[PDB]
Design a binder for this molecule. Structure first.
Ligand SMILES: N[C@@H](Cc1ccc(OP(=O)(O)O)cc1)C(=O)O
Length: 297
């Protein structure tokens, strides 16, 4: 059980060590392209890059680079694209990637401004009268409507390939209360938000991979993804005990570096998967409790 392990680590107060071990066993693949001099201004953080093997390639004959990675979870049969918070010169690229990869949803786990600094460009329109047109990638983006809650907002955006005039609806799930390098207020609010994304179809296989991002695209992003895959893995068999969280986090780190930034985010991942397992096991009432506990309205 992950719960027995949880209790053992907790009793022994060894989340730091456990996490140092993950950091030490994590894959290390080259990030040659991320490091090319022509891509310097396309990376927000010097120490956070996409491995070449899993990076998302833009279909432009100019510079196909974007700081984004495809986390392809074989056994769980679910993919996600983790990316950094778009920079002012990479918002067109970001939306280009969304169009090309056929994503239906974008999960934003950070705020534009955090800790007195700009952690991500304002890459989507905050009002409907004012659409965005990314000239470099020939795309148009319009806010259609938004549903603001206490700690998150869900937006319905319309993305148009100005070249073909094809149009797509993109859902934007914005978690506005998760501290950079922190953990959510409670498993309840996080699971409530996670099920909002799930219930939307965004995570479905009929669509391209959902784009998940934070500021670096690894801390809060990794946390979100780890919990989801773990819950999906136990869902296929209705067997929470067959899931090894550390092992799952490690398979994910083969696709992108630094997934889950602190020992507490790791600990929070366990709490979230343990609590979410109640639902997986047939107690669907727990979903209503998360809503309550979340205090979304
Ligand atoms: N380690 C760098 C870059 C970094 C930023 C954010 C971060 O987490 P998040 O993916 O959750 O935005 C991880 C790393 C920083 O501390 O500024």
């Amino acid at each position: 059980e992950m719960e027995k392990e949880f209790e053992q680590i907790d009793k022994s107060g060894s989340w730091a060590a456990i996490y140092q071990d993950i950091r030490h066993e994590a894959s290390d693949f080259p990030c040659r392209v991320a490091k090319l001099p022509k891509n310097k201004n396309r990376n927000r953080y010097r120490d956070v890059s996409p491995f070449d093997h899993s990076r998302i390639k833009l279909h432009q004959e100019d510079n196909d680079y974007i700081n984004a990675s495809l986390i392809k979870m074989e056994e769980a049969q679910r993919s996600y694209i983790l990316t950094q918070g778009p920079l002012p010169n990479t918002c067109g690229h970001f939306w280009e990637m969304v169009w090309e990869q056929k994503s239906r949803g974008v999960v934003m786990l950070n705020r534009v401004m955090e800790k007195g600094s700009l952690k991500c460009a304002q890459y989507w329109p905050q009002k409907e009268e004012k659409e965005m047109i990314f000239e470099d990638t020939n795309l148009k983006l319009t806010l259609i409507s938004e549903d603001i809650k206490t700690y998150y907002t869900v937006r319905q955006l319309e993305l148009e390939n100005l070249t073909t005039q094809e149009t797509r609806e993109i859902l934007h799930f914005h978690y506005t209360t998760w501290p950079d390098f922190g953990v959510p207020e409670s498993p309840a609010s996080f699971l409530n938000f996670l099920f909002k994304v799930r219930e939307s179809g965004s995570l479905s296989p009929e669509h391209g991979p959902v784009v998940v991002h934070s500021s670096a695209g690894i801390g809060r992003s990794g946390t979100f993804c780890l919990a989801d895959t773990c819950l999906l893995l136990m869902d296929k068999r209705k067997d929470p005990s067959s899931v090894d969280i550390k092992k799952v986090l490690l398979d994910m780190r083969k696709f992108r570096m630094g997934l889950i930034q602190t020992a507490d985010q790791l600990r929070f991942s366990y709490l979230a998967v343990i609590e979410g397992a109640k639902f997986i096991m047939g107690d669907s009432s727990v979903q209503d409790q998360w809503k309550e506990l979340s205090h979304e309205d």
